[PDB]
């Protein structure tokens, strides 16, 4: 399991994530966690709004309590208020962050959380306010290093100017790639860590779809691994300075997404599988 820097300000994470969501029966769900450790990744995602009452997190801070904490990188995040008809509130209140973070402290059961997020950005609210408290936490050693979500370019540069970003998380996967325009570079320029989402989720659900592609799977066949391991080594080779963190249930797939960790890509390989996204009567459909 390779490591890598994420961000400019000290954070070190196994170059796979591991998505917490998902898992949200107890001991299963421990299970699950322990293995992906055993395999090597270190960097575990969840927030406070995943799961009933932050169940999510309180199921990561048990899974902890089997685990060498400080060989473990926990992310978590604050910011949705409530999710009602209307869709998603968000709220950056320097009070609502502290309160949020220490209730997270409480429900993972740690002394502090290595990369804690703004989940969602509060519009009504200067990004320099909600970011100087996280800056505070940052002092205090209650978080260590700060990250955002699906943050704009102003929201980015202007939160950065008041403490370093650690990571912007965001979607980005073969399906989607709208953050290469101006996101990705802006992230380059700036030393923010790039951690992607839904790196293969979007394309199940697609292929899914479909099968209810054959370029994609022809591509897999030919790097000898199956396809959802293909779009998930293409998000890997797009960036040092990028940890995607897939989720799964089944030990089976944590080990079939490791895996794609062997899958070694060269650039006309990549540009190959980017472009593909964008009896004399026996013959069949050309690709
Ligand atoms: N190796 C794999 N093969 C097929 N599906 C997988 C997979 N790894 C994860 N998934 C699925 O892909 C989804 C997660 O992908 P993300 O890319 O981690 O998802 P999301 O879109 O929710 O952010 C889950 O539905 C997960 O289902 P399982 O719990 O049944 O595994």
Known sequence: ???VKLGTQGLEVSKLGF?????????????????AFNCGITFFDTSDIYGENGSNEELLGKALKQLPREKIQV??????????????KAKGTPDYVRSCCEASLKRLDVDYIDLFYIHRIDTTVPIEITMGELKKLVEEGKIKYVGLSEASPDTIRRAHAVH?????????????????????PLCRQLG?????????????????????????????????????????????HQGEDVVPIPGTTKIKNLHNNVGALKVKLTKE?????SDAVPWKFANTPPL
């Open 1 to 3: 399991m390779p490591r």
């Open 19 to 35: 998505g917490c969501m998902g898992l949200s029966p107890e001991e299963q769900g421990i299970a699950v966690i322990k293995e």
């Open 75 to 88: 992310g978590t995040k604050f910011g949705i208020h409530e999710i009602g008809f209307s869709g998603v």
């Open 164 to 184: 370093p970003v650690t990571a912007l998380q965001i979607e980005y996967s073969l399906w989607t790639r709208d953050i290469e325009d101006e996101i990705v």
């Open 192 to 236: 923010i860590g790039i951690v992607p989402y839904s790196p293969i989720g979007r394309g199940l659900f697609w292929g899914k779809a479909i099968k209810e592609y054959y370029r994609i799977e022809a591509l897999s066949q030919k790097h000898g691994c199956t396809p959802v391991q293909l779009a998930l080594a293409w998000v890997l």
């Open 269 to 273: 390989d990549l540009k190959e599988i």
